Curated annotation (Swiss-Prot):
Glycans are attached at N12, N66, N81. The keyword Cell membrane applies. It comes from Homo sapiens (Human). One of its GO terms (cellular component) is plasma membrane. The keyword Transcription does not apply. Changing F1S: No effect on CD2-binding. This is Lymphocyte function-associated antigen 3. One of its GO terms (biological process) is immune response. Residues 2-93 form the Ig-like domain. Ligand of the T-lymphocyte CD2 glycoprotein. This interaction is important in mediating thymocyte interactions with thymic epithelial cells, antigen-independent and -dependent interactions of T-lymphocytes with target cells and antigen-presenting cells and the T-lymphocyte rosetting with erythrocytes. In addition, the LFA-3/CD2 interaction may prime response by both the CD2+ and LFA-3+ cells. It comes from the Eukaryota.
Length: 171
């Protein structure tokens, strides 16, 4: 088992583990270090996870609260009567802010940019047409026409915001 999980800074995520036969004990590790456990009928969390994790005693599912970038990592769940691995790679992303659109009339160049966001992609549209996408926080485009306004969308795994603007240039 392997799973890709996307969380937001300061938010939380739950690593859902197949719930059938209740687990008697369960151990969660972040890389090779202990995160939390249900051992000998007692619960305990370790290091940075004390006070910010919840462990489902039935399924063994782990919930991590108040995510921070350091939390981005591979996590593994183990239980005595569970043969196979339960691996989860958690990515912690900051949400995108609203994109800004500006232009230069002289060289008919339109630029879109966005300040905040992790692994952001900017997508540009004019009318109902998707003109381009770039995995960057700034993207420029030389326009051929101004028959419709431009829409720029900033998107990442955990969020998205867009801005729409009409270009004002002398004909
Ligand atoms: C955990 O995140 C969810 C959305 O993913 C949110 O509804 C909830 O408020 C958060 N839990 C806590 C305790 O803040
Ligand atoms: C989350 O952690 C940050 C510091 O890293 C701080 O805002 C606070 O300790 C936590 N926030 C909440 C709502 O628990
Ligand atoms: C002109 O267009 C180029 C790209 O074609 C761009 O790099 C530049 O910022 C624009 N503005 C000016 C004043 O040249």
């Amino acid at each position: 088992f392997s799973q890709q999980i996307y969380g937001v800074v300061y938010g939380n995520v739950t690593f859902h583990v197949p719930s059938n036969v209740p687990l008697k004990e369960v151990l969660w590790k972040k890389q090779k270090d202990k995160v939390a456990e249900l051992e000998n009928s007692e619960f305990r969390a370790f290091s940075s996870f004390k006070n910010r994790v919840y462990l489902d005693t039935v399924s063994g599912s782990l919930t991590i609260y108040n995510l921070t970038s350091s939390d981005e990592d591979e996590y593994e769940m183990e239980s005595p009567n569970i043969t196979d691995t339960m691996k989860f790679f958690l990515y912690v992303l900051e949400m995108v802010s609203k994109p800004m659109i500006y232009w230069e009339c002289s060289n008919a160049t339109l630029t879109c940019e966005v300040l905040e966001g992790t692994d952001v992609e900017l997508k540009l549209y004019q009318g109902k047409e998707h003109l381009r996408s770039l995995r960057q926080k700034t993207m420029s485009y030389q326009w051929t026409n101004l028959r419709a306004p431009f829409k720029c969308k900033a998107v990442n795994r955990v969020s998205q915001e867009s801005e729409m603007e009409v270009v004002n240039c002398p004909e």
